[PDB]
Amino acid sequence: MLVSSNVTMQFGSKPLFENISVKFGGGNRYGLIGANGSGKSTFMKILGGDLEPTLGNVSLDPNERIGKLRQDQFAFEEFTVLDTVIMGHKELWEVKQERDRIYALPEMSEEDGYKVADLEVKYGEMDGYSAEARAGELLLGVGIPVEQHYGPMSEVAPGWKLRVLLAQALFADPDILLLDQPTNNLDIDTIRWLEQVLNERDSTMIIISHDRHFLNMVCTHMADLDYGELRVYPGNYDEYMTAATQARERLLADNAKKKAQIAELQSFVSRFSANASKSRQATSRARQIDKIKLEEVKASSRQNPFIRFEQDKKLFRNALEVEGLTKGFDNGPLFKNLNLLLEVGEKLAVLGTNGVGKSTLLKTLVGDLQPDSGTVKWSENARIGYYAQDHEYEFENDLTVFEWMSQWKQEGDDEQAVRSILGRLLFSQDDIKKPAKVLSGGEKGRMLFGKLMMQKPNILIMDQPTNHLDMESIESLNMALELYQGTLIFVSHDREFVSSLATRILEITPERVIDFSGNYEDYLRSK
Amino acid sequence: RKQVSDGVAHIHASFNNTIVTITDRQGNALGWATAGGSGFRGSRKSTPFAAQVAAERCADAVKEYGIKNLEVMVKGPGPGRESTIRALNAAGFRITNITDVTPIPHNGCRPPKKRR
Amino acid sequence: PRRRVIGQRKILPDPKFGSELLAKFVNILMVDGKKSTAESIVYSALETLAQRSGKSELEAFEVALENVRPTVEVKSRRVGGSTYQVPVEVRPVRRNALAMRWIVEAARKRGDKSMALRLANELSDAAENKGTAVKKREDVHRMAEANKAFA
Amino acid sequence: IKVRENEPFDVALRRFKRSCEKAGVLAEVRRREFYEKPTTERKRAKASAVKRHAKKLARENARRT
RNA sequence: CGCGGGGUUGAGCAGCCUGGUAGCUCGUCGGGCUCAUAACCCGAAGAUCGUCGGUUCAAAUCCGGCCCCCGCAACCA
RNA sequence: CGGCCGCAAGGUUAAAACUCAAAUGAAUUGACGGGGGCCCGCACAAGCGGUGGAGCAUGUGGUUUAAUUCGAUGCAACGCG
RNA sequence: UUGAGCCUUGAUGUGUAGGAUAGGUGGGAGGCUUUGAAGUGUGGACGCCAGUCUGCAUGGAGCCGACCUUGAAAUACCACC
RNA sequence: AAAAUGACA
Ligand SMILES: Nc1ncnc2c1ncn2[C@@H]1O[C@H](COP(=O)(O)OP(=O)(O)OP(=O)(O)O)[C@@H](O)[C@H]1O
Ligand SMILES: Nc1ncnc2c1ncn2[C@@H]1O[C@H](COP(=O)(O)OP(=O)(O)OP(=O)(O)O)[C@@H](O)[C@H]1O
Ligand SMILES: [Mg+2]
Ligand SMILES: [Mg+2]
Ligand SMILES: [Mg+2]
Ligand SMILES: [Mg+2]
Ligand SMILES: [Mg+2]
Ligand code: NA
Ligand code: NA
């Protein structure tokens, strides 16, 4: 049982969560919710002990091996598939890396003799003789075959990168703290595989997912972290909603019951005050008016970022007009022809299962990857905005939020129209100076949306926009896209996003690439 | 579970909705499926085709029980009255017989008037 | 229409090949009363199509047209206040006319070069269930089997 | 209403038990009692049935057929 | 001249709730439908957020001053 | 209004001043029906090409001017005398 | 009837590479088989559905272990859980 | 499903 004892963290110049304290322990699964930019992952890091709070104590469990999953599914790309899982267990991986300084150091000393003698013994205690024996079998159990065990992590579809990062946490695991497990959106078959895996085995878990249906099917508690603290509601998700909405309308009602019971007391005190026969009575409640002390109402951390995509120059005839791609990496080409046209339409929501190659199809279309042989071409007036599936090459080189957002823009004043597009999407003066390389998830995605809003492109490629969004930014982006008058593509795996606005849906399969049934509701109905 | 091998299929067809309940001979429901629950909200659930989908879906969620002989009991008016019986034979179920259980009161409670 | 019946309009067979199917195809894509160009485009779009397909006319065109024609098309059936559309079976005389109409509508797009290359590339890609013209037979089928709730 | 015909049907065709009760009472007893609408719709019911006898008795016409 | 509440488009109202989008319902105008008017469909117009100053990159919002309107109080032997 | 009856709602008996040259019944011919039936016309349906958006010619409303001559102004006036 | 704690007994458990559903701890290489076997026919229960498994008579006394692909060594057994 | 109205001679 791990306990938080008055934990506070101050990033920038305003405390994130003020003096929180709650007990975690047992076969329950405290999934926690919160708007992006407000605790959540930072609290998870505090619980894991990687980062210490400014005030409070972790009050750690003695040696119970907190097993964690990170938010980033791309932070591991050089360590091999069989390396990440074995690196998941710290005291084994560290000893292995230190013992690797034997064959690489041709000089050995007297102390180094003792150290090599005892580190091998520690390795034997930590089961280094079966460290790689216990990892490959788990990797095959999750559903990663042998052929890609020694291959680099770079050549893996992210739906399987997550499949391996989950297995990285499966080494004698009580107290597993899982960060955003979806994103790089799983098909849905992988999601149900996840849910059965998670709710079959018994352990103490902490989920942070944004998927309402997944959280309903998995968790039993909800450790919401919204206003200033972490308040836990026993409920899956539809009990938590009707608890945290009713208990807030009750706050407003019990505050209006004071705000309106002060009013008529003040009416009495204002009418019968100078009257000699009732002044002693007016002054009797003029002092009970000021002893009421109504309870304050805080501000919710969830907000709707106002995002709106314009059009720099309107192209007319048609945009894409691709004939034959036949792109391949190692196996037989993931697709062969894919001849299609755009006609300045809307979306054509590319989709499939994990590992088909929709992201590499979009890469070929946007031109950073060229096909084996074929032609794509765009209109001579086409301006392309790109939202990559993974965006780590962008948030680098240690710029402030202001500097990153100002490195864009065509002809705009430095003080407004660039510090205004930031404030239209949940940013303030205390946040326009923090480094770009430190924002978290949905905030980085929102920065990408802002750069798109300022570049004002005709064609939006927008690989997977709904990855880290707030579930309140998801519908804001939905409205922005359906009010956008340009051309776009996107490969989101969400159901009622493609179902919300798609018109030219294009499914992709290892054999048959279907295209344009209609609303995609008719597509799923015909299928 | 319990592998019920001889059951009943109560079809309650109405003007608006067609609802199918499959039960054992003791009247203990195993699974059910309606016309409107199959994505046919509105006037479409009052279609004979929606009953066909409802009956075929009610074949599932009870296929594990291994029911082989059915005793269908139709009830009420509506267009999804006949097209649903033919949808039970199309799922392999063997209808032993057909019966109609429709309440015809002997001038009992006064009926409504609410149409003009 | 109202009282009488119309037999048919006698259309002369195509000059180059004795086909009544090709002659109607020329007229459908013919525009602004100029049959001289339409026959020039079709004849050019067939010789450069036959050489790809390897045979002169039938698998070049008749096969390229038999795979683009529909079977079921949709229409509206307002009866007494209704608002639903229905799918209905099409008669064999309208299948070819619909097929030729769909090809040219899907071939007037794809703007790269003259119509001769625009159409020949359209027919060759439509001869293997691949082109954008042969796509329309799939949408019209999806709209014909995804609303079968009314018949 | 019941049809057993144990072995050989494979097909309902129970119109004989469909044209007995289902049409009449069930779709009539929903409303329209009024205690005197039936007594006047009945007067109109075979004020026209006897009218057919006049048409039955109107067989004596030439019509040049 | 003592205490409160307000001033946002032609009218009635939000947004001020802890600062980053001037909006709702009636109404006005120009078309369409009609024999014609209403109803209905499409498109559009406007305001110094009372005025004057103040920190703020940015104010309808936060602060100060003034004007206008609507209410209340100005007690008992 | 008065009398009688009634717990009450009201019932019953029953006027006048003033005002109009009409009110009404059955039937006939038309017209009309968001009444019924039959039939026709590019009327709809199936198609092809347009107007309404842009520039310009022209006619008409308004508005203006000393005068902006008069007439035509649903379909059936508005490339009209 | 359903929980939790204890005692006793019996069942109980793969890979990546296999003759094989190998818990370690390593002790050891010779026990185990006829107080009836090798294998034959009869099936319970479990079952990353291939197999363990045990009631069972008869048939009558061979099998195992070692080498071996392997991270590990094999119900050759036992103790400790 | 919705369909209101048209001063006199
Ligand atoms: N090291 C840091 N220094 C300063 N500010 C930070 C730092 N890390 C994060 N922040 C900011 O403070 C907040 C804490 O971010 P955090 O990682 O906790 O977000 P999160 O709520 O988990 O987000 P998401 O839901 O997108 O995962 C964010 O608003 C972020 O911009
Ligand atoms: N650089 C690469 N080298 C080798 N194989 C690759 C490479 N990039 C992708 N692949 C392979 O191509 C397939 C699809 O890759 P891709 O990144 O397009 O996935 P995806 O279908 O978009 O899935 P997701 O976005 O959910 O990860 C996978 O089998 C993946 O292993
Ligand atoms: Mg009522
Ligand atoms: Mg009368
Ligand atoms: Mg014009
Ligand atoms: Mg004139
Ligand atoms: Mg009136
Ligand atoms: Na985070
Ligand atoms: Na992808």
A349 is in an annotated binding site: no
Q: Which residue of B has its CA nearest to C151?
A: B49
Q: Is C111 on the interface with A (CB under 8 A)?
A: yes
Pair of tokens at residue C138? 């799939």
Strand H within 7 A of C80 CB: yes
Neighbouring C-beta atoms of residue B53, cutoff 10 Å: 24
Q: Report the DSSP pairing between strands B29-34 and B18-24.
A: antiparallel
Q: Which chain C residues contact residue A321 at CB under 8 A?
A: 110, 112
**Nucleotide minimizing C1' to CA distance for residue C80:** H1
Closest CA to A80 of A7, A150, A1: A150
Chains A and C, touching by 3 or more CB pairs within 8 angstroms: yes
- Method in brief: cryo-EM
B57 by DSSP, 3-state: which?
helix
**In DSSP terms, which residues pair with A24 in a beta bridge?**
A2
Touching D (3+ Cβ pairs <8 A), the chains are B
Residues A473 and A511: their CA atoms lie apart, in Å, by 36
Contacting residues of A for C147, CB less than 8 Å apart: 522
> Of ligand 1's atoms, which has the minimum distance to the CA of residue A180?
27
> Is the CB of A88 within 6 Å of ligand 1?
no
Q: How far is CA A300 from CA A76, A472, C8, in A?
A: 35, 12, 73
A249 vs A244, A257, A297, CA distance in Å? Answer: 9, 12, 11
After which residues does chain A show a gap where C to N exceeds 2.5 Å?
none
Distances (CA, A) of A482 to A345, A475, A485, A487: 12, 10, 8, 11
Distance CA A262, CA A318 (A): 66
Q: Within 10 A of A92 (CB to CB), how many other CB atoms are there?
A: 20
Choose which residue among A440, A446, A472, A474 to substitute to test ligand 1 binding: the one with the highest number of ligand atoms within 8 A of its C-beta: A440
Which mutation among A149, A188, A356 tests ligand 2's pocket best, with the greatest number of atoms within 8 A of CB? A356
B77 touching D (Cβ < 8 Å): yes
C-alpha A137: how far from its chain's center?
29
Determine contact, residues B42/B29, Cβ cutoff 8 Å: no
- CA–CA dist A356, A364 (Å, integer): 14
**Could you please report the per-residue DSSP string of B28-56?**
-EEEEEESGGGT-TTGGGGSHHHHHHHHH
The separation, in Å, between residue A27 CA and nucleotide G5 C1' comes to 20
| Token code pair at residue B47 | 């279609």
Cβ–Cβ contact C77 with B under 8 A: no
- Candidate from A321, A339, A526 with C-beta closest to C125: A339
User: 3-state class of A9 per DSSP?
Assistant: strand
Exposure b/e, C13-28, CB count within 10 A at least 16 = b: ebeeeeeebbbebbeb
Residue nearest to nucleotide F46 (CA to C1'): C1
Burial class for D58, CB neighbours closer than 10 Å (0-12, 13-18, 19+): exposed
Pocket test for ligand 2, best of A80, A81, A329, A362 (most atoms within 8 A of CB): A329
- Nearest CA-CA partner of A30 in A7, A6, A3, A58: A3
- What gap in Å lies between CA A383 and CA A312, rounded to an integer? 8
Q: Nearest by CB to C145, which of A515, A516, A526? A: A526
Extract the tokens encoding A372.
Answer: 């084996």
Q: How far is the CA of A296 from the C1' of G9 (A)?
A: 67
Chain B residues in contact with D14 by the CB 8 A cut-off are 98
Burial, C48: exposed, middle or buried (Cβ in 10 Å; 0-12, 13-18, 19+)? middle
Question: Are residues A333 and A311 in contact, defined by beta-carbon separation less than 8 angstroms?
Answer: no
Q: Which of residues 420-459 of A touch strand E (CB under 7 A)?
A: 420, 423-424, 428-429
The atom of ligand 2 lying closest to the CA of A157 is 27
**Which residues place a Cβ less than 5 A from the ion ligand 8?**
A 41, 71, 440-441
Secondary structure E strands in chain B: 7-13, 18-24, 29-34, 69-75, 94-100
Q: Taking Cα atoms as reference points, which of B2, B1, B32 lies closest to residue B17?
A: B32
Distance from CA(A146) to C1'(G15), angstroms, rounded: 12
CA of C4 to C1' of F40 (A): 12
Of A337, A518, A522, nearest to C130 by CB-CB distance is A337
Nearest-angstrom CA–CA distance, A69 and A171: 12
Euclidean distance between CA atoms C101 and C24, whole angstroms: 10
